[model samples]
Target: GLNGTMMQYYEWHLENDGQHWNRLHDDAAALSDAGITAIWIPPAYKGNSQADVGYGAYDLYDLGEFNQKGTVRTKYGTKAQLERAIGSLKSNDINVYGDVVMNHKMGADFTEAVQAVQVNPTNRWQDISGAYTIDAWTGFDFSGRNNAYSDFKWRWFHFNGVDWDQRYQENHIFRFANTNWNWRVDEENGNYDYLLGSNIDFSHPEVQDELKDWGSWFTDELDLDGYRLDAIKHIPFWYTSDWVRHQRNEADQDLFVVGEYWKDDVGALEFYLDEMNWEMSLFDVPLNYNFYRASQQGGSYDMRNILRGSLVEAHPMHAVTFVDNHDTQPGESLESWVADWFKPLAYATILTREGGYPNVFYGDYYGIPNDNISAKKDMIDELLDARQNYAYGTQHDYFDHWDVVGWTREGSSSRPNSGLATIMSNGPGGSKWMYVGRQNAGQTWTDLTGNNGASVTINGDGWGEFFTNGGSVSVYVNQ
Candidate 1:
């Protein structure tokens, strides 16, 4: 129902110094006090190298106990410090949900491979005598196998004419000399692919076991309530779904699992969402970048369209809606347009209504004129208050694919005889006002934002809030 960010996503916790760690603690505390229910942290596991920020690669045992590499340290802090932070967050009633990296790790790519050992992708399992047990991450030799696996063809994007045939395994090598395999390469005139790629072979059993073990440890051992999944679409669909199932069912917890499928295509986004809903009840992404259009171009027209585009009815409950994230920014720089004031309106629509799960973006409260760190905490306060008092269980979108955009909220009330109805205008300095108890009636109400009271009647000629240039407003209705 709320969102949290890991200050150091992948670096060693010891590397973080203490400035950001303290900020993380403060943010978690603020979020919890604000009445938010959960905060998803990063994987505190040991990574491929010291530079690996939890995502690269490392040992599972390193995380569960303070004795190993994954324990909080120099950049990140200590394992005890992490647990203490968790305790601080929990004391305020906030549940901790850790973000987990599945499907692949920090390994060598084909272009830089050094030996047959480097050519293999599957982590190159070794016996006591150091004998190679498998070839690639999938246990298949990409160099010799041709036509056995499907080749991915790239066209307009780049790497044109390049098909990933298994036979080219030699070309797909991960190491060259002693350099890291993860880098960028120009496959075409101006395009490239992940040169230092570390993707797991979902087709491999050990990879599945790796993920399963991770889920078990996070939920059962860590006692964490939920998870935020990273890079889901890169792997096959069922693989992620099965991972969620194991985490929730086998972990013996009501785990909230969400996957990040960062894409723009509606069909493509819907594909992963549909698959997850078919298998589980949660996914990490909701309200695509289009939602930014609604916020930046605040009004009923675009916001309504984006809402319809970003969310669907089949699995509205699982949608994770937010204005911006680490991926999507308001514009070119972090400082642009991600102002805090507009959040009230944004949450008023998303959290006060129905459809996708809501996420609160926790940007630094420093440097901004209006937003001190307290600004975000204040919003969290408001959100926690909203979630506690209101029941946003149902929704009714009156008009869609039409000029006027109507987003109405119903079925929310810990209040007796009280429900919320919201209508928006798409026009600049545009206004939306509605009369009580009349879905369509000749009743006029005063505009709240603009002091000019107007005779606004619904179900009659010249009714509903209107829009102009690029501003829309919403008013909560009781009937």
Candidate 2:
């Protein structure tokens, strides 16, 4: 089997035309043929409204089918179109990963008076106020759906906390009565259980049962292949594992689950992977930070040590390397978008190198119009095709330079002409002599990226000098 690529299928600022499923259905076969093996669709459930990007997570049961969220179709499209899109992609042998937003729910249908206490925002462990009646938007009767799938109704006990008090008309983190904050969360702000909206309560058995029931129904509803976990750090970490494992064990499916545990430290990532015992992989946030750092610093950053503090560099098997994502786009919260000119070099490192599973962001491939970002479709396509056809077998590294770095993958014996030599430069580009193999001694190669304009002739020693243009990258494959 060939190494395949993953494409994030949506961005934050899409047009809200409610036709994304149509687009995905149309593009499924072409995407699979273009070497994309997996597609991670955005959260398909109804959000606060039709335009709410699905992360607001108003209702899970109302997946564009009900009249909730003030519209029938979600920001993507109707549930019918979504199922059709998934079926189309599945028929083309492309796996689909549904985005799972289980951290919190927004836009409650009604408000309820609940006994609560205010905790210190900085140190959430310290309670600042005694029990008081706070009007919380914790009721989700889903009047639009009218209990179509499951008749379970979400009450004040279904969630642990809410951020807004309708009675006071102010935003303050209020913890409900008879419930303590869940452990196994990030240590930020003492305990980072309360993110935005009404935080779900896993401590409540009924809540757990309802969510598990929905999990089973959602999986069976779409015949899903995998899941892209949303905001795992905010949710109780151990509970997330339990939930995902339940999905895996129930379906007897080896689901390819990846969580967005978004800390820029690989140490934390390493711990998460270890805690889960390799059950799920995480996005290589540190690698993207390194890419951002290199793009910002240019030649001053050591080219050889570009990947030193990255998860992909150490734990490649459980790393999903990505260049950018919805949150990292120009104006988003984690706006460390890589500089435009450096994208090719960064992509080459991810796509050509034999490390983490590469995920191409929709913002990068299709462009972010809110920030005037141009589409790099052709650029990503070339690298993806190169990754599929030529990136295989034993690898030799030339990480011996301060400005230039290169690596070569020896051709696999089973696959003819399946080897590649990649070279990149941050400041000024030159040539690096790397060994392909003794079998490839007399083979000719050319740059696949077209950044380098010269042909390379492999010498008798199984070594060839590969060239990369200044501030660019080149992938030379056997001709």
Candidate 3:
């Protein structure tokens, strides 16, 4: 879950159907009614621990079969309930994507596993003192652990483990050489067994078959739009590349597969995309980081770099760029409040800018403490309309920049000459505006924010620019 986790929803959906009888179904219908294209639900399978997050998946069937009283009960409801939700959503032209965990499961830390080995705990399965437990189901290669692309279709990292040494007791650690990255593992007591929480040798053949089979079956059986690959970074080149190909071969083109690469910018992001040509694309981590900074006066050009980088780096076909995700800006951070004021700016950037599909977090409109699942649905409806009406499947490009970055996008096919352009300033009191469309240098114009009005027109070839007192500028051209 790179974007964020749905702890309560998962627990509620686990058994919501039998007891609540349409509670979950009704909610999902409501989301469809509100125009949310997709709902990024957590993994439904069983977990090592009973905590709310679904990352610790141990069994995929745990989706809704037996956990009727679990928090996810209402979240998932029933299989029929889920089908109805999906059907209703698709009928309304909304897409629903399910989450799946490919990495380690919860339970004991590596230390705990080692301790279990020494004590021979009855609950645990693998022995840690001597044997290294490896997963043979994933087909790919990561043994080299270098930056190289694979050719056999899948990248091979799918079965690779997030290297965690039992030598240290820490659950998460920075790689010996790489400070920005982290390695995590599950353990018990003091003994460490598996080098990783769960090591799935990517080079295995059966692993490839399993991935293709599973994805094909999952998408076909569920009639899903596609999967949100959880812990996508853990998978190697062949896995991402082949999985996407296999999915496309099995499912239709519209069935998108957005990878959770978790990489920050174009550089790290390229490493992920190089491995797989996923049908859907990826969650834009760099965009969110830049948005967080740009929302305030962090730096205007940095924001521009983020936007440009997304266009320059990602695969030419697809990318799901966003301004704020669940984990990106914590609730306590200042960026959260500013996220609202600058939300319109962010929408302009993602929608009008180039190189990726735009996706908004469904329930982040109001800044509140409790996870009020129902609160932001209304706002989400409006935002979706804005996206479809203004920027859906439209041409986009990076316009101009300095301390202020600007870009514009033509309105959708249904709405011509409704193009929108936006400028952002990340300097204290720094501001700028540009005449969109053909660029009127001195054309007469008035601020939508209502500061001051002036008649300005563009010069020779139609180009004009303006700087605000302490804010960014955006000019919507409808000519």
Candidate 4:
């Protein structure tokens, strides 16, 4: 019954110099005031080096506590700063969602001689080269950590495969001898268990135990309210389910865990959800791509069919709807950035609708300096305010046209004048006659976006016409 917004607090093309944690701490109040209920922080653990983003995870136990990558702090900040920031965010009543990257490990302490076969990059299952002994970067002594937290040691036997062979200087997928890729994973490139660096073997009992223990430790240490699982499809389905269940049970709280399945196929996402027993929500990848296509097509695109193949439409409870993220921003691997002109429309679609939980992207809110992208903070602020204050009650949809679509919400009894009517167009400007409920009859409504300065008067029957600009969106609320 509680609908709220989540904010991704980082982007890939950000100016990375270890100032984000402090900035986030300072901006906590502002974000809370702006109606962000949860903030999804990036990987706080130490990466391969200080310059490396937290994704290239080197040391899981070192969250700026020890000197391991030529620096005592990760790219964000030191452990003290991170804790203070999380404390500040929590103090403002905003939940913190830690980014959990357990797909692979990198920057090993030493290289170990191991027998392996090189597989084709395009088709990972086909071994192109015969088995041979090569030095693989799978040894991890964690000398800097010095057995501070857990005395777990990693070696070649702990991993199923690796992407690089340090001894041969080859860049190919190498699967270790007497090891197999974990089954029940996404069927990408034959098998996606081996993504980057040293792929951990979930089948190994020690590895499983260590990962679960780390989850518990992390949850207790950071006092995390939820987790944003990284590259979930790359990990085994059963292992992720067990990990999530164990952490939630250990904490004895409803942790809002969401996974990055990263597949545009809604059927595949549904299948994965079924496999996981619906333990977590997934980012609506199909909805994002649909927004991208709609942005590109403009008027030619059918706005009525925008949510045709999205999890938010079919499985609302398990969908975390988002427009763009760090990877989808410009110059990244999954470069499908939604056009700036269409962002307002996209935001209105997600925020005003009574469907999936909407997530606002940081790159869109704060602006990307390197890419010269302007911040949509002003527009998003209005949407967020409306979502927090007025977007409630019974929902009605009007997808009767191809160029324009809209929906309305009847006010909830707890919140007076909480009804909202939203209209969006991927085509020319137009108006739609929608019902706002008989309770709002004879009341005045106005566009919150301010793009349309005109005010609307609801008829005696609670029917009103709302206007929107071409290729834009307008939200109407009781003024």
Candidate 5:
């Protein structure tokens, strides 16, 4: 666990060929060598269909082990392949953080006559019509698995609402009978409890029990080191806290869990951390937004305010920082992809800054085939190397400039050759005199990125004028 970094190993449009697990198993060693300490794998369970990316979750227990969802294998692969992948990853000293889609269940088996009311799409709390019976597609009888694992059949009561009503032949936010939206949830659309599909009711005792049981089962089944809790804001915050605590106790291990609360507000993230008792780390969505804004605005976006309102700045320990993800990829829902020019700078900020658990998106590393996006493997690998090695000990920031900024990491005695100086400019190339350490005066340094071929000689006072090209990041280490 030497300066660990996490790699999200899947993209939005990966081929549904059912060989992803095998690919992961084969690439486990390479990923580890590239300084990836953890891999945040996509959901292994069965989704709505074979093509489903597992976000539209159909069955949690069926991890490509059953002939449900019109396919025996998930988009990744079979259960045995998944186990082998995990084994290979673990053997290479890489932890596996499986994605958990527990917010809702989709692709139901049948429809049931359930009492419902249409709520305003803009404001979810306000019902637009009176309660009436509707043929809701909420019956989840996992007949394909035949109760091989757990016979937890889901009905309308297990969920609070659904969008499609078969009886009315319409699509609306239909709240189920005798149900209110869960408390302590995001208030995006005024109490944004329901996201998609049959929204799980955390208030229901039975639903809670089922989910807890699933968590315990999934943890043991995969021997997972951690989890990526999907769409946590849509579910009740307290339930997520409780569920994470339960998983930690059940696993009997330091099971790391990060939540996806997609709001770009540091205060809200801080509120969530407090509400959850700091039980889990959260994806630093606000940092990504800051990066996004900087990437778009270029020279106008002040580099001095890059870390403004970021979770990494406020609570680094509880922040899982990243540049992009499946959702942020081009053509995806949350399509706020940071411009390619600023990606290196963004990566350097997250990787070399000596705070937050940085996550590398698969789309960036492997490229997005769907969009003809080229892989940034070379740049990412270099940054990863810098993170694993040079990114250690004390860090000092130089955020005085509008378009040029840099930081220096004083090498730790515990790790040899671990010091680094990183500088980048979105507008134009410039030299910044930053202090690395007084301990290492007159040391020669070279750019690891090779963006700037010139080397810098540290002055007697341990300050070196690092140079970066226009819209580029340069990481300098001992030459």
Candidate 6:
């Protein structure tokens, strides 16, 4: 059986009232019934501030447990509430994937005088300014935590570089004179290791040991089923590989781990996967970009070329297919929100396929309140229904047209009425003659999406004429 679908579980602007965990606990049964096998919760740990979106890493030990960062509770809820939520989700047979942001740490306790040289924003390896002494925010004592979990004190020595200097009152890419960026990271800006705040140095043995120890404690404390790793390209590849392997070995659990490489180049993603020995899954960034371009191109884009440069097309098992995520929402840093109209087609391409592990975005399912974005829950429910029941067995693709492309599934013996036929078009509506297998011969099929009201009767050869609406999708199943 398939591992099943994953839901992101939180959006950028989720009312910010700090009851998200409770709401999630309450909605666990509903989510499970809706076919969500896994839930990727936001970073449960405390951030720089209560309003911080969790990417700005602060105290890994403070999962709304200690009074730190000017608040006792994070944006989600208290530590107890989070634990209850996870318990409920697990009870409902849903796997919980905790968001792990280990690339950088922010909101230091004090500043330290360090000799640093500024580097070019475009090319990080090229130094733009001479070495000078400046007050860098790199010291973290974790006084609020009070060494509850581990007494691993963070300081300038544990980190390789800091981006801001409090004395200068300006933001600059500063690299410490005693350290250099880790090798074998993304070459986007000549070793894209330093992203923001104080970057962790994997080269330092103490830093590595502390991080690995923290990983063990975190897994045991949370009892997490998996991890949604943050900013893999910025972190050292070898470190991530070792951390994942260590956690798995220590826990003796086949923990699912997916990384956010955040690169559209399939080659880069493939290279990184190879570098890690394919220990984890990676988000299909190329597929997301293809969806963005196809939505923007309208009828001009060739539908057959949709999966040309995607990891899902090449390495489906290692690909985590997603339409959009927190970073790709309307006003985020990686703002490339797919057009709402194209979402159904994009979703159908992933969910109805027999390849990549599909993920549902929280913003798309629950609506972005800040942006007045309405929820696509109803449509997503239909697609999930198909995925849960009918999307099984062998698949046959029809990619002969530039505007329309579709696939049909031969029903699985394990499930009755389980086969599905999906058709999508970026242009005018049309019908495609597709084979649904000889077993489905003389059977009646209806469009699950309700885009087409008419039912199609399978021919003696198990072939049916599937109809779809222009710039829309129609899923035919024997309901």
How accurate locally, in lDDT, is each candidate? 0.45, 0.88, 0.46, 0.90, 0.91, 0.90
- For model 3 the TM-score comes to 0.64
Candidates 3 and 6 compared: the better one by lDDT is 6
Candidate 5 Cα errors over 4 Å, as ranges: none
Predicted structure 3: lDDT: 0.46
Q: Single out the weakest 10-residue window by summed lDDT for candidate 5.
A: 245-254
- The regions of model 4 sitting more than 4 angstroms off are none
Using TM-score as the yardstick, the better of models 3 and 5 is: 5
Rank list by lDDT: 5, 6, 4, 2, 3, 1
* lDDT by residue (tens digit), candidate 6, 112-184: 9888899998788999999998788888888778989888788887777887988887789888887888876
Which 10-residue window of candidate 4 scores lowest in summed lDDT?
11-20
Q: Per-prediction TM-score, please? A: 0.63, 0.98, 0.64, 0.98, 0.99, 0.99
lDDT agreement of model 2 with the native: 0.88
Candidate 4 C-alpha error for residue 288, in Å: 0.8
User: Which ten-residue region of model 6 has the weakest summed lDDT?
Assistant: 151-160
- TM-score pick, better of 1 and 2: 2
Between prediction 5 and prediction 6, the one with superior lDDT is 5
How many backbone clashes are present in model 2? Answer: 0
lDDT at position 111, candidate 5: 90
On the 0 to 100 scale, the lDDT of residue 332 in model 1 is 28
Q: What is the lDDT of residue 387 in candidate 6?
A: 95
Can you write out model 1's per-residue Cα lDDT over 301-354, one digit (the tens) per residue? 344454545543445665666555544433222222334444445554555555
- What are the candidates' C-alpha RMSDs? 11.0, 1.2, 10.4, 1.1, 0.9, 1.0
For candidate 5, report its TM-score: 0.99
Q: What is the lDDT of candidate 5?
A: 0.91
